[PDB]
Design a protein around this ligand. Structure first.
Ligand SMILES: *C(=C)[C@H](C[C@@H]1CCNC1=O)NC(=O)[C@@H]1[C@@H]2[C@H](CN1C(=O)[C@@H](NC(=O)C(F)(F)F)C(C)(C)C)C2(C)C
Ligand SMILES: *C(=C)[C@H](C[C@@H]1CCNC1=O)NC(=O)[C@@H]1[C@@H]2[C@H](CN1C(=O)[C@@H](NC(=O)C(F)(F)F)C(C)(C)C)C2(C)C
Lengths: 305, 305
């Protein structure tokens, strides 16, 4: 029993991380096969930042202008190119620790693990969600860029995020591994602000089921609601619409606990209308929206990699 | 910026985990050099559990009665012995992925990462604290025992916990890697209850400093207090005493922020006396006590391994 914010084991990703230095700027790269992937703003000087012409900056660079280091070992760059907002550096050595891997673009609401890195070396791992406004609530300092977010399925690593920047409220923005940003953000030092955020309703319901499975049951009531009447109440409290596909995805937890999705919706409605009144759920005094249905099942049934 | 509950990278520990099977019971072991370490209750049948004589149960067992598997590879046991509540199984193969390592007994208040495992395979990683009552608030299912807790310093893995059991309130108890329990717990299925828990004051102060560093400043007041008058108020709200050694350990954060430890104590006193009034600190509506001073510095300055 117990329920914790839990990350994927990071060992497969750890063997892929390298340091990339261009002039005076250092950040992290992902070494897979004989390619190193990193944010293109490595080629900017603390100067180019307000309005850079990346295509131009890259035309001046030769292979030797990129120093790539894997622990203590120098990797010679033998080719370079740009794809959207990431650089691909072709190196003379295939990484012998390359996992089985895919590149995926995740949707808002989905969770992943971040391996926070500095100077090509891991500092720590944590789990977060892709918010509806296309930001994440991470922990990233100067030098963190090129840190990656990932999921594991058995032995296949799904790379889904590479970190690029920090926005005013202390939230974070980055790209997929093909270099396209999540959200309306660009890689320049200019006035940018996150859209207002909403609460991921399907995940809050998944979390309420996790609470029942672990024996925290005080918030269950004897009523039901319709999907439509629930969605009126959700909108008022800045919650995403709940769709029929979300009800289908909650099917396994609903089955396991014997509580119909629309019955749990009635319980959430009363929590939103009446507050929690100093009581906690799973040790928390706020409703938690960074667990997917799949995350709940994984932790509560003990799936391994 | 940002502050997250962050675990150590787990890759070094992942290469040490194996499956240990004795008769019908399977759990996890830690393979270091040519020794596998695991909880001794692997030699119990779902029967022996209420009151086992381990010394007796072990006398009946031969080397072949332990099946040890490392991924798909069989490790032959060539010797076995017991030390307190852990078995040491001598195997015919030295683990080629053995990290630099130490065994340490941690004190209450200290934090570590748990690599939750089933069938010798990692499920996830999370951070927790050794509570004052010598329990941890983890996430562990049937088959989790022998999962380990650890710290990293640069390249040295400090193993500090091996998981053995779950107590009534859904909290967890286990041993150091020499087999001695944390707290007054025994490895039998009998009526056991955690002592009442207290809040780790030094860690709550460390967390308030983390909040200032990240720009969350609303709770700072213009007053000071004495260590003695603070400690009267702490005791009333079930907080550990704050000692002069704890003030010395907070020295770096106090220096960095320019807020004297006793000034932050005055702020915490008002939070305890007057509540937080619907406001959050670092996104949280409760005071958080699972970050040590060292954890705050690490995350906020970007220390790597
Ligand atoms: C990567 C090395 C670094 C990571 C930042 C630094 C602090 N925390 C982080 O996550 N990224 C940058 O420095 C990028 C890079 C230059 C400016 N920048 C920013 O993150 C800036 N943010 C913004 O300009 C904006 F989001 F728009 F508000 C900064 C103000 C935090 C420095 C680019 C975008 C090329
Ligand atoms: C390890 C494989 C397993 C891990 C437990 C199972 C559920 N969550 C966990 O962390 N440990 C055990 O099954 C141990 C083992 C038998 C009984 N036991 C317990 O954890 C039990 N707890 C207690 O008896 C007590 F803490 F005292 F209340 C149980 C009731 C949770 C099964 C020993 C201690 C030999």
């Amino acid at each position: 029993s117990g329920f914790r914010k839990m990350a994927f084991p990071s060992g497969k990703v750890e063997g892929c991380m390298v340091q990339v230095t261009c002039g005076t700027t250092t950040l992290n790269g992902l070494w897979l096969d004989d390619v190193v992937y990193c944010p293109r703003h490595v080629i900017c000087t603390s100067e180019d930042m307000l309005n850079p012409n990346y295509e131009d900056l890259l035309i001046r660079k030769s292979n030797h202008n990129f120093l790539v280091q894997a622990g203590n070992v120098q990797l010679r760059v033998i080719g370079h190119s740009m794809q959207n907002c990431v650089l691909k550096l072709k190196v003379d050595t295939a990484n012998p620790k390359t996992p089985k891997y895919k590149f995926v673009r995740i949707q808002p609401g989905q969770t992943f693990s971040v391996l926070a890195c500095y100077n090509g070396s891991p500092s720590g791992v944590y789990q977060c969600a892709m918010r509806p406004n296309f930001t994440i609530k991470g922990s990233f300092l100067n030098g963190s860029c090129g840190s990656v977010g990932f999921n594991i399925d058995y032995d296949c690593v799904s790379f889904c995020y590479m970190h690029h920047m920090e926005l005013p409220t202390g939230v974070h923005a980055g790209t997929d591994l093909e270099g396209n940003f999540y959200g309306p953000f660009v890689d320049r030092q200019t006035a940018q602000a996150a859209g207002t955020d909403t609460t991921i309703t399907v995940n809050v319901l998944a979390w309420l089921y996790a609470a029942v499975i672990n024996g925290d049951r005080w918030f269950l009531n004897r009523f039901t609601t319709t999907l439509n009447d629930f969605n009126l109440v959700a909108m008022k409290y800045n919650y995403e619409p709940l769709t029929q596909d979300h009800v289908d995805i909650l099917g396994p937890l609903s089955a396991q606990t014997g509580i119909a999705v629309l019955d749990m919706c009635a319980s959430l409605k009363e929590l939103l209308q009446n507050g929690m009144n100093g009581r906690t759920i799973l040790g928390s005094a706020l409703l938690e929206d960074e667990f997917t249905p799949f995350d709940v099942v994984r932790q509560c049934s003990g799936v391994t990699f």
